[PDB]
Amino acid sequence: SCRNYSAPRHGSLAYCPKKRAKTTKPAIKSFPKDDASKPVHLTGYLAYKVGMTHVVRLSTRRSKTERVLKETQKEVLDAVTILEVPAMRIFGMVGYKSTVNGLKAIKTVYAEHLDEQVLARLRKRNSRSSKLMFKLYPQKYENGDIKRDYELLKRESDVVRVLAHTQVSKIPSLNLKKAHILEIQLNGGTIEEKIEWAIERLEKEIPVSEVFSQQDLIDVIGVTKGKGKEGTTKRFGTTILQHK
Amino acid sequence: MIGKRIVIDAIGHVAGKLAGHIAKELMCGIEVVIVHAENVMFTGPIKRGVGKFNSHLNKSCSYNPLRGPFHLRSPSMHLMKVIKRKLPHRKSKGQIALKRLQVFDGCPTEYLSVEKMVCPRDKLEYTTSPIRKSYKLGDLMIKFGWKYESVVEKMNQNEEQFKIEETEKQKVKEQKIEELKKSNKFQQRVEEIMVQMA
């Protein structure tokens, strides 16, 4: 038989199955469309959540059809979040090729000198290492392997991305000695221009002012607070049954 | 026979007719590679094809969609599933047979040089009347979310380059040898080697 009265569903099926995220650090998985008509620029960055406060702003927004003569100005109180963004350092690049199975990576190329903070991500336990990690790679600069590598990237690639890490040693409250590593896409110009722009900047520091400015719209990707195992009343919002 | 391989150019064949011939070979031990899956032809208007495909997407497992049917959206994979159900795939003999088959949209670089076979009985211009409509599988599959059309257009342009280069490279050797072999300097040594084999 049909149910007696109509009502909406509890919770959205767009988020089922609701399983736990695998690790706490997110990759940007989707990037805005490239346009060859513009200069070479970066498309993303990493940040740390500090906390919240509130502000008062002035406003003058009203219906275009509102017949009121006076240029009314009004105070509005708003809540805001603060994020800390120290400069990231560039340490390598990756090229990709388009196939019937999507984008696949061709080769990765690293800077001649790498920092202790970034090498620390490559080992599991910080305090127990022989530190023989990248010690043989610098020969590839002498041998011309680097110059052969750039040729292959420049010859056969559709998309180019840089590798950047964050300077965790500047934020002591994190209690963290391993940097976080992110792969960031370059839009604008041609493949050759993109590669030259990257090559000029390995080992250097890019400030956040390169990427974003005031009044801009941005997308924020993150992992939510954890709450453990929970019942249906809190997980999906269903009503509590009769008291007896 | 086990140990024989065959490469098929799929263009201009009617899908359900080629699939029957291919499936018989897989059961006899041949390894088959199909190339150009996006160019196979179906008969009738495209309008009818669209409705048959809509009725297929509607099918799903009621209690758990991750068990239910998987609706494949690539020309290569679609033609693979047409061949799959003309084999005994619920049993080991069919599962062995299936692993001998590969299907590609376009022509990959490892198969440009290899000589290629064709099936005259299944070509559209033999097996159907001229006065009725048809469509390509590549034309139907863009409407249900295939995303690699442009990648295949770029491949198709590399093939044309290779065809013109190889034909130009061949015609010169044909001319060279045929002009050479009329000469006395050639026809002399015929005798010089035969003196030692007669």
Added chain:
Amino acid sequence: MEVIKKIELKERVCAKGTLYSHKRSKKNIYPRYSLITIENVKTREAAMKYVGNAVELFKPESTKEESIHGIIKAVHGRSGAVRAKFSRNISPVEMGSKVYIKLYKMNEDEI
């Protein structure tokens, strides 16, 4: 290596065919007889000229016996396939395999 030589010797002198099924109806199988197709033989009239000829299945990876002998008994159907009998029953695992046709006749008792 004797196996590599024994193959080349056989390749130079025999016609080639493949094993594809036992004699069967829609429901039942008769594993005493097997069905073969021969390379370029494509009519029943063409196929009749092979009735009586010897056949051999050679299997080098075998630990027991390196080859099985048999004889072609009859034509089967209208497109040039044949029926044959061997000294032992052919396993379902051996379907799809290559068979050699030996260009001389033998008696049903010899196998």
Added chain:
Amino acid sequence: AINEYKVYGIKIDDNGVVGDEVYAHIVFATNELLAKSSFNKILKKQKKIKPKNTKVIKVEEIKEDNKDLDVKNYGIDYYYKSKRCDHKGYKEFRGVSRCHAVDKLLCDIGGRHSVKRNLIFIMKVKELTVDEIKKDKIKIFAMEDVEYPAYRNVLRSNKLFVSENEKLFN
């Protein structure tokens, strides 16, 4: 294939040759038994002699010559049984024999009206000259004015798979 036969027969009672008449019937059929069957059918419907009082004295086949396979025009008068009633009509055909003409009618009505061959009856077969032709269909072919090209392709070889660079059709 269809053939032409002529059957002859008399009446008998408890004693022989009870009438001095002999009856004849020309028929198109596949064999002699189908011919004899027709003779019995017509006798019982146009007279009233049932088989037990009949005897067939002769059956003969009728055959033409036409060593050069010359092509001729024929007109045929026929009827057939449908679900409603019996339908009469006339049609014209071309061929190398009366039997060749008759086999083409039987095929035609089966195609156009969904009738098995035993429900069709031939009344008359006549050979005609160019001035006699009534309907539109055959006149252009009779006046010798037709040429056309080939619409159907033809296979070159019996092999199932062939190399891409070979010639495939005709």
Added chain:
Amino acid sequence: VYVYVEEKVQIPEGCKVEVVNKKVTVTGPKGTVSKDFSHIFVFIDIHEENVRCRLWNCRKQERSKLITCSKLIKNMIDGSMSGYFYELKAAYKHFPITFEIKENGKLLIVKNFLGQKWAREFKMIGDTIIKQGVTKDHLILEGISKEDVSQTAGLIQNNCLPKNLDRRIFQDGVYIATKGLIE
């Protein structure tokens, strides 16, 4: 079943025509047009200063397609010796319609239809160009291709009518007044 069907079109003094496969291409004073007949089963060729279509042993509905093919070819030839035109006329009982031509005659804007405050924008298909007529209420379209010209005119007529009003009281519109070849 028809035994034989033939249709013929004559190529005028200035014109030149070629046939590659089933694509037929035409050149002449006003420019070039081409059309592909690969979707019809027919045999097309050029013979003694004519374009010739043929079929043998065909059904009733196949010969209709042959004839249709022959009429389209004539329109291509005619359009190449002189182009076609279409004439539009604005009609109103209260609110005067006004027209703007932009982008060298590739864009038309309409304003004030039935007192509506929002504008409407229409784009010219293919070779076509839009021009002002004898009084402010008239527009003229001119082009090589009868298809492209007539399709454009139709789109304007079909959009510029009343909606959800009684059309025999509210008679305002933009109507196709005249059509033909240019002199």
Added chain:
Amino acid sequence: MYFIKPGCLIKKKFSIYTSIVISVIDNNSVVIQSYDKSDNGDVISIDREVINVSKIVPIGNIDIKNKSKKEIDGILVEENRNLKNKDDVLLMNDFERFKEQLKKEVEDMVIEEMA
């Protein structure tokens, strides 16, 4: 393109020798004079026959505006005089076949050194 009209020269399905069309019956059948040869001892035979058009391939035209059967037999025996059932390599004895093979095989060894 060729046409099916009296005097067209045709081949039949899976056959090497030419034959000729004599009369046209309807939009799908014709009367032909057909040539064939018994490989058992070179015994030829030519005879008339009714055939459907889906089994024949046109290749050319001749006159025969008016001729008798015996005349057209003459036309046909001249036309296909040059043709054969099989490549001679399969018909000759073993030693002759090997002698013919050597010529080709030696010629390659020359060309591969000379090129």
Added chain:
RNA sequence: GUUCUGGUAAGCAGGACUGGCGAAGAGGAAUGAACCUGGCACUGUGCUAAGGAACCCAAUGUCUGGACAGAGACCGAAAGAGGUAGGUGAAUAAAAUU
């Protein structure tokens, strides 16, 4: 299966005649107590039935007409127009047409 009586009917209730399943396997209708072929001790070689012959799956092709509807091969009524293939009977005709 062929027929009959009661009932709007029913895989409903109740009779008559000739074979079945009960107490009947085997091959075929994808599957099915009763339908098609056809009645069983135990082996070996040949041949046919019913039903099949692109592929699943042992064996498949040919000729002539129809038919375009995500139709049909599996499938509902009284009532009907449209498209196309043919028959017969009326006209008119300075190609034909109704």
